[PDB]
Symmetry: C2
């Protein structure tokens, strides 16, 4: 049905790509997202980091607030998605 | 919203270098519906900035009046984040 590959998502990514530091991310993402949406994105990213650190689901749920349903969905993206989490994890390590 | 865990997400977003990498990363982190709502707000924001009517905006983007009103609220009383990115995309263009 619905698909993310479109001209409009392309333009949204152009906007994201011009953000230069964390302050500009708060400025932009607070305008475009609700607090709950941005917190949900941050929670998934934290869950992905802990799954890659081989932590248990209880450890993950305690630290991140995530339910098993949310953890399972990140886990599925992690193991069967685009390798996008691992892409940014490596690049962040290079950085320092 | 200002936490070390949100900082961490933003460090990740900042290491993306092109549209292909954004598709890679955001398709893993967001659902289809989430990414499409964000893109919809961003197009609404653009058309609002260009003084298009709610009518013309709904028809072009499918956004509800509630959606359009929220984006408008953001343009009026927010951080000027939309404005910041619009300006830079125009200069890349020029």
């Amino acid at each position: 049905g619905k698909k993310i590959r479109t001209e409009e998502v392309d333009h949204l990514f152009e906007a994201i790509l011009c953000l230069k530091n964390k302050e500009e991310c708060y400025t932009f993402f607070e305008d475009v997202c609700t607090i709950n949406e941005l917190l949900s994105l941050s929670q998934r990213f934290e869950v992905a980091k802990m799954l890659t650190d081989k932590r248990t689901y209880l450890d993950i749920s305690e630290k991140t607030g995530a339910s098993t349903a949310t953890i399972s969905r990140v886990n599925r993206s992690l193991n069967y998605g685009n390798d996008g989490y691992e892409m940014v994890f490596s690049r962040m390590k290079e950085k320092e």
